[PDB]
Amino acid sequence: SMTSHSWLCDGRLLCLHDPSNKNNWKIFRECWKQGQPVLVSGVHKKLKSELWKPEAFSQEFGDQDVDLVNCRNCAIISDVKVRDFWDGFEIICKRLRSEDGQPMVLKLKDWPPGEDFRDMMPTRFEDLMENLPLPEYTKRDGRLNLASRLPSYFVRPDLGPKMYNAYGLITAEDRRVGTTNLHLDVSDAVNVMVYVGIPIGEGAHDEEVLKTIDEGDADEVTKERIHDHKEKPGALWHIYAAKDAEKIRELLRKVGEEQGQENPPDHDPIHDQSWYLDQTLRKRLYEEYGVQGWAIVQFLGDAVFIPAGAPHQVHNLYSCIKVAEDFVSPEHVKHCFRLT
Ligand SMILES: Cc1nc2ccc(O)cc2o1
Ligand SMILES: [Cl-]
Ligand SMILES: [Cl-]
Ligand SMILES: [Cl-]
Ligand SMILES: [Cl-]
Ligand SMILES: [Mn+2]
């Protein structure tokens, strides 16, 4: 039976089922006020699927110059064509190779660049913005988005949305690497999975994906969503409450010192965006500091709501196209105030 919602993370994560239900706000606002993330499924069914394919991006924009990142070692690949990224998105035999002769796991950096999504892709912009869930919070002019309404005493978000494009991590060694390292944002955000690419060539690689979700601490109901098939898994997230950010900084200063980094006692390891919390570090955070997070698998068409101030990291299971919009809810406006 169709239902309004369900729970993941053993009751700690709200999952809304109908992205355009006019009564979603009544269930959402209780969880949101408590500083929790929220998941909304089904957004892909609202979108024009032909606008979100890797082959269309390559055909329309392939001659633009861009930089890539090697996710395994953080090396920058400078001033290449955007088709060099898109043509290897699902076909492994077409990827740029490292010195060892392996195909690289790449992230497309800052594309479209800065605030240029709307000018570059006006049809994509309309398709996304008209289909975002919780539209009183998430639209540029929504009644519960204070972004356009605040004076300079508040850090205001850039004009969005922003696109996040990267290959899937593949090997047992790759399990300890992030697509996006641990960081926080002073605005709220909604992140939508608009396409998941499952390759062919080294097709048959779903085996190491199961071990990553399991070791990632995914709850038993998320494992039913994985093991049932039916839906394509994109990325594994770990999100932490804003109230636990300083305890995470204390752990990462202790570990930086143990690993012989030489850092002033005050430096900010979350702002540096240099760490990925692997299974060893997540267990140490729980046991030594008393901090629990939320382990979230974002499937095709899932919208993740990330509260302002909440530290979070992303690990792509397969090749992903994500689109995110920042907003300023009244519940979390304290996180962007410039005094006290
Ligand atoms: C519809 C569908 N195709 C899949 C391929 C791999 C997988 O891990 C889940 C999938 O769900
Ligand atoms: Cl808060
Ligand atoms: Cl467009
Ligand atoms: Cl709403
Ligand atoms: Cl990163
Ligand atoms: Mn973020």
Ligand nearest to the CA of 32: 2
Secondary-structure breakdown of the chain: helix, strand, coil percentages, each rounded to the nearest 5: 35, 25, 45
What span, in angstroms and rounded, lies between the C-alpha atoms of 334 and 184? 14
Q: Residue 91 carries which side chain, given as an amino acid letter?
A: I
Residue of 43, 94, 87 whose CA lies nearest to 63:
87
Give Dmax (Cα) for the chain.
57
Q: How many CB atoms lie within 10 A of CB 340?
A: 4
Q: How was this structure determined?
A: X-ray
Residue of 168, 192, 188, 190 whose CA lies nearest to 179:
168
What span, in angstroms and rounded, lies between the C-alpha atoms of 88 and 93? 7
* Distance from residue 304's CA to the centre of ligand 4 (Å): 15
The upper half-sphere exposure of residue 235, i.e. CA atoms within 13 Å in the direction of its Cβ, equals 30
The bridge status of strand 38-40 relative to strand 13-16 is parallel
Residue 231 CA, closest ligand 1 atom number: 11
Residues with CB under 5 A from ligand 4 (ion): 25, 134, 136
The one-character DSSP state at 337 is B
Q: What are the residue ranges spanned by the domains of the chain?
A: 1-340
Specify the fold of 1-340.
Jelly Rolls (2.60.120)
Angle at CA of residue 24, ends 20 and 30, nearest 5°: 155
For this entry, resolution in Å reads: 1.5
Q: Can you tell me whether residue 68 is helix, strand or coil?
A: strand
What span, in angstroms and rounded, lies between the C-alpha atoms of 215 and 122? 40
| Mutate-to-test residue for ligand 1 from 207, 227, 231, 232, highest number of ligand atoms within 8 A of CB | 232
What span, in angstroms and rounded, lies between the C-alpha atoms of 294 and 198? 25
What radius of gyration, in Å, describes the C-alpha atoms of the chain? Answer: 20
| Mutate-to-test residue for ligand 1 from 45, 90, 202, 206, highest number of ligand atoms within 8 A of CB | 206
What span, in angstroms and rounded, lies between the C-alpha atoms of 83 and 63? 7
